[PDB]
Amino acid sequence: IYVLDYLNETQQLTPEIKSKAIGYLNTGYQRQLNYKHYDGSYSTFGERYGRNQGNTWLTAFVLKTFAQARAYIFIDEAHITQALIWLSQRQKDNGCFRSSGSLLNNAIKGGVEDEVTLSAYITIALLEIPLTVTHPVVRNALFCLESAWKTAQEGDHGSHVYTKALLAYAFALAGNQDKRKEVLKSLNEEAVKKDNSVHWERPQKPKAPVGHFYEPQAPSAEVEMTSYVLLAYLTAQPAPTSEDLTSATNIVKWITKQQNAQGGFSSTQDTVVALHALSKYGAATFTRTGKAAQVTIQSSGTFSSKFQVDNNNRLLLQQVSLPELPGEYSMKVTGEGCVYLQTS
């Protein structure tokens, strides 16, 4: 569905694959419906015996996917509302939700099952819905989140990375642009900038004896941390700026080069979230209409240069080389249609 978003945003879409995916969607949806809880929740098996309680994280993932499927195609609001109240019922007055564990595997998931991160993925997948940031539940969540950020932050360690960035995104949803950029800067604190782009890891090794092979209880969760960061810098109320989108593009380059040739990425989680972030990247930047750019580069040494970027040459790359030991190089662009420019 985030794939379809990719197609639509980037415009690379035929009705054929579109109908194929549609049939895929309806089928997977209903196969999911066979595994739910009559409360509204979801487990890996569920039905044909009430000898269980459903999970949460799953149901939140479900909620999100249901949201976007709504965003194009038809789906019952009843189910989101039921899963929502179910979440609430697994809410504490002051504490967060609880990992009501009924899963089978964890590489499916992109965190450490920390209750705060759990709640965090929940509430953020919530606020992607049309939601009043002043809602009761989410207000309570935000108290969790805020307290949680403080203890993460003032304490030298709070997982140092991912907890913190997901916090960043929920803060982004709020209106708390101040808190947003603050924890954003805390993410930039342990920054992992590269030759031509940036990223983060988890803390580059787990300190305890770990690993050996197969990513056992540790799927390395390396991208989705950046995906939500690619939301983090991005999304706000009015519209975005330079700096946000610069850092975005950096990690976007990290992202697409981190893309896997077999298809997708290392997993489904990272894949979904990257595609969401890239889609909205385009949904801002990629103006399918904006088609009349024009540019001049001017250096004080009158090393002139003139180009154009348009839909017909959309993926073009009009490189041009540069001799002046001192840079005096004044960029200038105009018109319509987004451009990413790179020099070294």
Ligand X SMILES: *[C@@H]1O[C@H](CO)[C@@H](O[C@@H]2O[C@H](CO)[C@@H](O[C@@H]3O[C@H](CO)[C@@H](O)[C@H](O)[C@@H]3O)[C@H](O)[C@H]2NC(C)=O)[C@H](O)[C@H]1NC(C)=O
Q: What angle do CA 88, 94, 99 make, to 5 degrees?
A: 55
Single-letter amino acid code for the residue at 178: D
Min dist. Cβ of residue 80 to other proteins (A): 9
Helices (H), the chain: 2-10, 15-33, 57-72, 77-89, 115-127, 136-154, 162-174, 177-189, 224-232, 242-258, 269-284
Question: 262 is in the binding site of which of ligand X, other proteins, a copy of itself, none (Cβ under 5 to 8 A by kind)?
Answer: none
26 scored as a contact of a copy of itself (CB under 8 A): yes
Q: Which of 11, 19, 204, 313 binds a copy of itself (CB under 8 A)?
A: 19
Question: 33 is in the binding site of which of ligand X, other proteins, a copy of itself, none (Cβ under 5 to 8 A by kind)?
Answer: a copy of itself
Q: What angle do CA 138, 140, 144 make, to 5 degrees?
A: 110
Whole-angstrom distance, CA of residue 139 vs CA of residue 141:
5
Part in contact with a copy of itself (CB under 8 A); list of ranges 56-64, 71-79, 249-257, 260-268: 71-79
Single-letter amino acid code for the residue at 284: A
71 scored as a contact of a copy of itself (CB under 8 A): no
284 scored as a contact of ligand X (CB under 6 A): no
Min dist. Cβ of residue 100 to other proteins (A): 9
35 scored as a contact of a copy of itself (CB under 8 A): no
Closest to other proteins by CB, 59 or 227: 59
Provide the phi-psi class of 264: left if phi over 0, else alpha when psi is between -120 and 50, else beta: left
Min dist. Cβ of residue 41 to ligand X (A): 30
Q: How far is CA 229 from CA 61, 180, 302, in A?
A: 18, 11, 40
Whole-angstrom distance, CA of residue 332 vs CA of residue 325:
21
48 scored as a contact of a copy of itself (CB under 8 A): no
* Site of interaction with ligand X (CB under 6 A): 8, 13
* Site of interaction with a copy of itself (CB under 8 A): 19, 22-23, 26-27, 29-31, 33, 74, 76-78
